Paper text:
The N-term domain identified as GBLD, residues 55 to 260, presents a β-sandwich fold. Two loops, comprising residues 79 to 105 and 138 to 163, extend from the GBLD and wrap around the Cd. Additional calcium and magnesium ions were modelled in the [name]–BgAtri complex and [name] apo crystal structures. However, in these experiments both ions were present at a concentration of 50 mM, increasing the likelihood of nonspecific binding.
We showed by HPAEC-PAD and LC-FD-MS/MS that [name] is specific for blood group A tetrasaccharide type II (BgA II). Structural alignment to homologous GH98 enzymes identified the binding pocket and the general acid catalytic residue as Glu 411, which is present in a cleft in the centre of the Cd.
Numbering used by the authors: 48 to 893
The structure:
C-alpha cells in the first residue's frame, strides 16, 4: 500500500536530458533512490573489523564547451504532478573522505575531508519542455535561466554539500525555497531542471534528485488539526519497539525487534478497543552504533522508513526516537546512537509521507551533553507541531533537568511557540536517587501553569535492579539482568493509578519484552495488569487541568528538596507511589522564568479555566520547612480517611493501594461512606502489591469493588536460576545479543507464558493473598458475589477463592474475606447502615 506522497523521480518512467555541449554518463544513478552507495550491507557494513569507506557514485554531467563549466540536468516525469519537496545531493567530498575520530574519542567515527560548496545552483520547474513557463524553486549565483524565466530579486548564497543533500520547498518567500512549508504546499510540474557549477572543473556528479509529489490533486494532503489528541479524555500508552541491532538495507522481512517481536506483531497484539489510545516508538537501539556519517544516516533512515511503512499498512501510529545520549547532528553532539546522523529534511519528509507518523521521543541526553540535545529538540519540536504532531521528553529531574531545557534560547523560544505539543514524563530508572516524587511535581507543575500540553510516566523495571532481588530481599550479588525481572506486576498498576489521579495522560513501561511481551505475545504484566487498568483509564477520564487547578490551594516554585514529601504525601521510594492522596502530587513549577513570571503565567491559566488562582510559594518559604510544613498543608487540605494505606477519592470513586515496595506488611484504610448514615465505615486491609477501585451506589445499599494484586514469583526461576540460564553482560560466540537479554527473552518465551501451550510453563502466580473488608454498622448480613474474576492459565489453578462473609448480630460488623492473585470485580448488596456511636473519627492526631 503506497502512501500519498511518493518520490515521483523514482516511481515514474523518467527521461533524463542535459543541455547543448554536455555529456551525460550513468543517467540511472540520479533516480535509483540511493544517496550512499554502500557495498557491505551483508557484513554489518564492515570489511573485517573496519567500517567500509564512503565511495561516492552518481550521474556525471560534463561541459564540453570551452571556458564554460556550468551544466544542467533535466528530469521529465512524463506528466504534470503536484510537487511538494525536492532533495538534491551532489558529490560531497573533493577526493575520498577518510574515517577518523569522533565523540567520544576512540569509539565514535566521523568522515574527514574537504567538502564542496557548489555555485550557480538553481532549480526551475514547469510544464513546457523548454521551461519557457519556468518557476524558480531555488536560485544562487548568476546561472543563465531559460528564455521567459526572470531572475528573482532575492538570491541565495552557496552552502556546503551534506551527506543527506539539500531540501527545497515550493514557497520562494520562505527562505528562498529552503524554508519548510505547510503540508500540501504544491506546484504542478512535469519538467525539473537543476543548474550547477563545480568550483574546480567542468564535471558535476549528481548522486540523487528526489522529487516528492502526488499522483493527482485529489491525493494532496492538508493538516486539519492535530494527528492525535493527548489529554485526560484521550490518554496514550507508548510501547517501545527496540531494534535487535540486526538490519540489512534491502532485506525483505520487517526490522527484527528485541525478543523476536515485529512492528506489525506488537500492533496486532493490542485489543481493538485500545488501538486508538496506543502508539509504537521505533528505537534504533545500538544498530550500527558509532558508525561514520554515510552508514549511520543510511541505517537511521532505512530502519525508520521500513518501520513506518509496515505501521502504515497496519494503521499503527508511530513515534521515532529523535535523540538519546546527546547523539545529534548539532555542534557538540556524540555518536552514541545513529540519531547523530539525523537529517531534519528527512524528518520533515517522514511527516509529509506517512500520515501515521505522529511523535518524536527524547530521553537520557543530559549525562552526555546539555545544549546540543536542546538545539536538536528545539528543531524537532518545531517540525512536530508544524504537522500537528507531538514531542515527549522522558527524564528524572535531580533539580536542573527542566532548568537546563529552558536555559537554551532556541528550546525556550520553541516551547513558547509549540509548548502545547510538548509532554514531560518521569523515568525512575535511577530508583536509588529519591527524585521520583519531585520529578512528578515538576512535570505536573509545568502542565498546570500552561507551559506544556501534559505530563505522564515511564516506569522502568531497572528501578528494581538498583534496590531489590527476590521478593522482600535487597539487591545481593545477582546479575543485573536477573534483578530486571523481579518487579511485582501489580506495582506497575499502583504507579499508573498514581499518575492518573494527578491528571497524567501518557503511560510508558520498560523493559518492553517483560512489561509488554516477547514473540508477538502479551506478557503476564500486560494481560492481567496494564491492559485492564488502561481500559479503565480510557473509559473514566483523569482529572482535567480545570479539576486539578480547582483542588490546588498552593503551588511551589524552585528546586524542591527530595525529602519535602516525608511527613506529607510519603517518603520518596524511587517507585513513584504515595502514602496518601490527601495532598495530590503537589505541583512545583520549575525555572520556566522568575517567580514573578511563573506567577503571572499560573494566575492567567486559572483565569482561562474559570477557577480561583492558587497561592505561589518559593520552596524556601518558612511555611514549607521540616517543622512548619505539616501544619500548613493539614490546614489547607482536610483528611479524607484514616490509615497507613494509600487512598484518594476522585469523582465519587475511592482508589487505594498498599504502598510497601518490598517489605511484607499489611496496611489498612478506613473510609467514611456516602448515604443518609454518616457513621457508616468501610475498613480495607491489604498485603503488598495490591490496588483497589471502589464505587458506592450512593443510596447507601450497595458497593462495587475491583481489586488487583497480580504478582508472579521469580524467586526460583530467575534468582535460584532453576533452568540454568546464562545471566551475564557478555556475548556468546556468533551471537548479536548478550546472554542476559537472551535469558530474559527465553524466560518470557518458555517459563512465564499466558495460556501456556504444551511444553511451556504457566506464570508462577498461584500463591493467593488475603484482602479483608469490615463494614459497620449494619442491621443484617450483606450479600457479596464475584461478578467477574481472573480465570486460570492452562495449569487450571484458580487466581481467587469465593468470598467468605461473617456477620456479628451483636456489633453489626460484617467481615468479608477473599484470597486473590490477580483481579476480581466484587458486588456487595443488601447494605442497611444504622447509627454507630463508635464509628472511627475521620480526623488528624492531636
Ligand atoms: Ca542515486
Ligand atoms: Mg496556554
Ligand atoms: Mg458511585
Ligand atoms: Mg495461575
Amino acid at each position: 500500500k503506497a502512501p500519498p506522497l511518493v518520490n515521483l523521480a523514482e516511481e515514474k518512467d523518467v527521461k533524463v536530458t542535459v543541455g547543448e555541449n554536455m555529456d551525460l554518463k550513468n543517467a540511472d544513478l540520479l533516480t535509483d533512490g540511493d544517496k550512499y552507495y554502500l557495498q557491505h550491507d551483508a557484513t554489518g557494513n564492515k570489511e573485517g573489523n573496519n567500517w567500509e569507506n564512503y565511495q561516492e557514485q552518481g550521474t556525471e554531467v560534463t561541459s564540453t564547451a570551452e571556458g564554460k563549466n556550468g551544466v544542467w540536468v533535466q528530469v521529465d516525469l512524463g506528466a504534470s504532478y503536484p510537487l511538494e519537496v525536492i532533495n538534491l545531493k551532489r558529490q560531497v567530498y573533493d577526493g575520498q573522505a577518510t574515517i577518523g575520530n569522533g565523540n567520544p574519542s576512540g569509539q565514535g567515527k566521523r568522515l574527514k575531508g574537504t567538502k564542496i560548496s557548489y555555485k550557480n545552483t538553481a532549480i526551475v520547474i514547469g510544464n513546457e519542455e523548454d521551461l519557457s513557463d519556468g518557476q524558480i524553486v531555488y536560485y544562487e549565483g548568476n546561472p543563465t535561466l531559460p528564455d521567459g524565466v526572470k531572475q528573482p530579486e532575492n538570491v541565495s548564497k552557496p552552502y556546503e554539500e551534506a551527506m543527506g543533500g539539500q531540501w527545497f520547498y515550493m514557497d520562494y518567500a520562505n527562505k528562498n525555497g529552503l524554508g519548510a512549508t505547510e503540508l500540501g504546499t504544491t506546484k504542478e510540474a512535469r519538467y525539473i531542471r537543476v543548474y550547477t557549477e563545480n568550483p574546480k572543473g567542468a564535471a558535476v556528479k549528481f548522486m540523487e534528485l528526489g522529487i516528492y509529489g502526488y499522483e493527482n490533486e485529489q491525493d494532496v494532503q492538508s493538516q486539519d488539526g492535530p494527528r492525535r489528541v493527548i489529554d485526560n479524555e484521550h490518554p496514550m500508552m507508548i510501547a517501545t519497539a527496540y531494534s535487535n541491532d540486526v538490519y540489512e538495507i534491502g532485506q525483505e522481512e520487517g526490522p527484527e525487534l528485541q525478543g523476536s517481536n515485529t512492528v506489525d506483531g506488537r500492533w496486532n497484539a493490542i485489543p481493538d478497543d485500545l488501538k486508538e489510545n496506543n502508539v509504537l516508538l521505533l528505537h534504533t537501539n545500538n544498530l550500527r552504533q558509532f558508525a561514520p556519517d554515510h552508514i549511520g544516516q543510511a541505517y537511521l533512515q532505512a530502519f525508520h522508513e521500513h518501520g513506518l511503512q509496515i505501521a502504515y499498512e497496519q494503521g499503527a501510529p508511530i513515534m521515532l526516537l529523535g535523540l538519546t545520549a546527546a547523539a545529534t547532528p548539532e555542534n557538540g553532539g556524540t555518536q552514541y546512537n545513529i540519531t547523530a546522523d539525523m537529517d531534519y529534511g528527512w524528518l520533515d519528509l517522514m511527516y509529509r509521507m506517512y500520515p501515521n507518523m505522529q511523535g518524536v521521543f527524547n530521553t537520557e541526553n543530559f549525562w552526555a551533553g546539555i545544549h546540543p540535545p536542546c538545539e536538536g529538540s528545539a528543531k524537532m519540536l518545531e517540525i512536530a507541531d508544524r504537522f500537528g504532531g507531538f514531542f515527549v521528553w522522558s527524564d528524572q529531574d535531580h533539580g536542573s533537568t527542566v532548568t537546563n531545557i529552558v536555559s537554551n534560547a532556541n528550546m525556550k523560544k520553541a516551547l513558547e511557540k509549540h509548548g502545547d505539543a510538548f509532554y514531560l514524563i518521569y523515568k525512575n530508572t535511577s530508583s536509588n536517587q529519591p527524585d521520583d516524587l519531585k520529578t512528578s511535581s515538576f512535570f505536573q507543575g509545568s502542565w498546570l501553569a500552561g507551559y506544556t500540553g501534559g505530563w505522564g510516566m515511564l516506569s522502568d523495571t531497572w528501578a528494581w535492579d538498583k534496590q531489590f532481588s527476590k521478593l522482600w530481599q535487597g539487591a545481593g550479588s545477582y546479575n543485573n539482568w536477573q534483578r530486571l525481572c523481579g518487579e511485582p506486576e501489580a506495582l506497575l498498576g499502583m504507579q499508573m493509578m498514581s499518575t492518573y489521579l494527578g491528571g497524567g495522560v501518557i503511560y510508558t513501561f520498560e523493559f518492553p519484552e517483560i512489561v509488554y511481551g516477547t514473540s508477538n505475545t502479551n506478557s503476564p504484566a500486560n494481560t492481567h495488569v496494564l491492559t485492564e487498568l488502561f481500559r479503565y483509564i480510557v473509559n473514566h477520564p483523569a482529572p482535567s487541568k480545570k479539576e486539578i487547578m480547582e483542588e490546588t490551594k498552593a503551588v511551589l516554585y524552585g528546586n524542591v528538596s527530595s525529602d519535602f514529601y516525608s511527613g506529607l504525601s510519603g517518603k520518596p521510594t524511587g517507585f513513584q507511589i504515595y502514602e496518601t492522596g490527601r495532598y495530590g502530587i503537589i505541583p512545583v513549577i520549575p525555572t520556566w522564568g522568575t517567580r514573578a513570571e511563573v506567577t503571572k503565567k499560573l494566575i492567567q491559566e486559572a483565569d482561562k479555566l474559570g477557577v480561583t488562582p492558587p497561592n505561589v510559594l518559593d520552596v524556601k518559604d518558612k511555611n514549607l520547612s521540616g517543622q512548619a510544613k505539616q501544619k500548613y498543608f493539614k490546614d489547607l487540605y482536610p483528611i479524607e480517611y484514616v490509615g497507613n494505606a494509600f487512598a484518594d477519592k476522585w469523582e465519587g470513586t475511592w482508589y487505594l493501594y498498599n504502598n510497601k515496595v518490598n517489605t511484607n506488611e499489611k496496611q489498612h484504610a478506613i473510609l467514611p461512606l456516602e448515604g443518609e448514615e454518616e457513621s457508616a465505615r468501610l475498613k480495607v486491609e491489604m498485603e503488598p502489591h495490591e490496588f483497589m477501585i471502589m464505587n458506592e451506589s450512593g443510596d447507601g445499599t450497595a458497593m462495587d469493588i475491583t481489586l488487583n494484586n497480580y504478582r508472579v514469583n521469580k524467586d526460583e526461576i530467575i534468582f535460584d536460576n532453576k533452568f540454568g540460564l546464562t545471566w551475564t553482560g557478555d556475548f556468546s560466540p556468533g551471537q548479536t545479543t548478550i546472554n542476559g537479554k537472551l535469558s530474559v527473552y527465553k524466560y518470557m518465551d518458555e517459563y512465564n507464558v499466558v495460556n501456556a501451550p504444551e511444553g511451556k510453563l504457566s506464570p508462577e502466580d498461584n500463591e493467593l493473598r488475603t484482602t479483608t473488608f469490615e463494614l459497620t454498622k449494619l442491621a443484617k448480613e450483606p450479600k457479596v458475589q464475584v461478578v467477574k474474576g481472573q480465570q486460570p492459565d492452562t495449569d487450571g489453578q484458580p487466581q481467587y477463592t469465593e468470598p467468605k462473609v461473617e456477620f456479628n448480630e451483636e456489633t453489626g460488623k460484617a467481615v468479608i474475606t477473599i484470597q486473590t492473585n490477580g483481579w476480581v470485580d466484587l458486588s456487595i448488596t443488601g447494605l442497611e447502615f444504622v447509627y454507630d456511636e463508635n464509628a472511627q473519627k475521620i480526623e488528624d492526631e492531636p
